[PDB]
Eukaryotic translation initiation factor 4E (Homo sapiens), 187 residues
Amino acid sequence: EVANPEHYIKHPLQNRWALWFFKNDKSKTWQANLRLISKFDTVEDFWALYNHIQLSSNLMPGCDYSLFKDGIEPMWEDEKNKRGGRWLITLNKQQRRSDLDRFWLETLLCLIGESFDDYSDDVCGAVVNVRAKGDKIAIWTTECENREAVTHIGRVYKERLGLPPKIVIGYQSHADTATKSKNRFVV
Ligand SMILES: CNc1nc2nc(-c3ccc(P(=O)(O)O)cc3)n(CCOc3ccc(Cl)cc3)c2c(=O)[nH]1
C-alpha cells in the first residue's frame, strides 16, 4: 500500500560532506577568508551543488575549493587532521587546461562514492588550490602513520585519475608541510 522508494527517494551518500571556499582577500585573517559554501548527503544534491558553482579552472589565482566530511574542519588544526597528511597532485599550467577540472571532479566522486573501500575511514577530505604558479589538488588522510592505508589510498587515487606509472605522486605529513620548505611516501 506504500510507494516504491526507488522512484521518489533521493540517493543517500554514505557520508554528509561540506564544500568550502577560500578567497584570497589579502586584507583579512586567513581563518576568516575560509568560508563554508554548503553541505550535502545525497547524490542528487551533490550534482546540484557541483553544477551551480564555477569550474575550478575559472576561479581567480589564490582561491581554493575543498570538500570535507561533515565535522572535519578543512585545516591542520582539526582533531582528525593533526596526525595526518596528504597525497599531492602538482599540476603545471598546461594541465590547468587539460586536467584540472576532471582531476578535481574525479577527486570529488572518489570521496563521496567512497572509492577507497575499507580505507575510506582514513579519508578526511580534499583540496584544490588555484595558483598562478601552477595548481594543486590534495587528498587529506587522518593518520600519516597508517602505511597500509595511506599507500593503498594513494594508489587507488593515482589509478582513478588515470595517471601513468612513470608519474610518481608523493604524500607529505601535515606537521612537515606546516613547518617546512618532503614525502613520507611515494607511488
Ligand atoms: C593556522 N591556521 C591554518 N593555516 C593554514 N594555512 C594553510 C595553507 C596551506 C598551504 C598553502 P599553499 O598551497 O599556498 O602553500 C596555503 C595555506 N593551511 C592548510 C589548509 O589550506 C587550505 C586552503 C584552502 C582551503 Cl579551501 C582549505 C585548506 C592551514 C591550516 O590548515 N590552518
Summary: The CA atoms of residues 22 and 100 lie 17 Å apart. Helices lie at 30-33, 43-52, 79-82, 95-98, 100-112, 147-161, 174-177. The chain is about 30% helix and 30% strand.
